[PDB]
């Protein structure tokens, strides 16, 4: 659905806003970014708009090699450049009658 897409886009972005505030939210987005090898919604640059995330700081889960603190002062070559919304979203659309039906 485009409801599946629009909602996932909206929710992923709202969860990015809550990432600094809620360590459970942080753990959830971390597992998404690490397991699907993606960062941010459209792009890693999306983190630039999130408080507690300076410029040149992304979650460690965006790193290609996840080590403690790797997202601090990150280099573009060391991070997943693709956004999570299109990548995870296409996976959700491909598995929709197993994740959302009542």
């Amino acid at each position: 659905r485009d409801k599946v897409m629009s909602e996932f886009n909206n929710n992923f972005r709202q969860q990015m806003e809550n990432y600094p505030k809620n360590s459970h939210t942080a753990s959830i987005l971390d597992r998404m970014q690490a397991d699907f090898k993606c960062c941010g919604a459209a792009s890693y640059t999306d983190w630039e708009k999130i408080p507690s995330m300076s410029k040149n700081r992304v979650p460690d889960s965006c790193c290609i090699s996840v080590t403690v603190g790797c997202g601090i002062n990150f280099n573009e070559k060391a991070i997943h450049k693709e956004g999570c919304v299109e990548k995870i979203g296409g996976w959700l659309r491909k598995n929709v009658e197993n994740l959302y039906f009542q």
Partner: nanobody, 127 residues
Framework: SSQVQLVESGGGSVQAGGSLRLSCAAS????????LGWFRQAPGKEREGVAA????????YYANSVKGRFTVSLDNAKNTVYLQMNSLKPEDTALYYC??????????????????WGQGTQVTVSA
Amino acid sequence: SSQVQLVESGGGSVQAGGSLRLSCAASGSISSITYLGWFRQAPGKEREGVAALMTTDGSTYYANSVKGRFTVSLDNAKNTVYLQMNSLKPEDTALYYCAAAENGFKIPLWEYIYTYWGQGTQVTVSA
């Protein structure tokens, strides 16, 4: 995480066509919970969502392979969520996990939205 604990019970071994009722007792800071879900991991297979209940409105969600046979329900007074399982098949054999999700994503049968997990209870269904 340790703010919420989930404890499953009611597993066992039954002959095909029989029934079980799993229960999951939630404790800790559970007022945050938006979905209570049941996941299962069968021998040799990845974990899959089976049934989920949204606390917000009581809505329920089922995997297609269990629709009509399994029912998820919540006894608020006991802080316990149930999975009634009827007409059990050998392919229902699995470790069943209780899980809980807080607010964030509205994808009830996807384990990536759930933060709290029980240890699992074994369900064995004989041919």
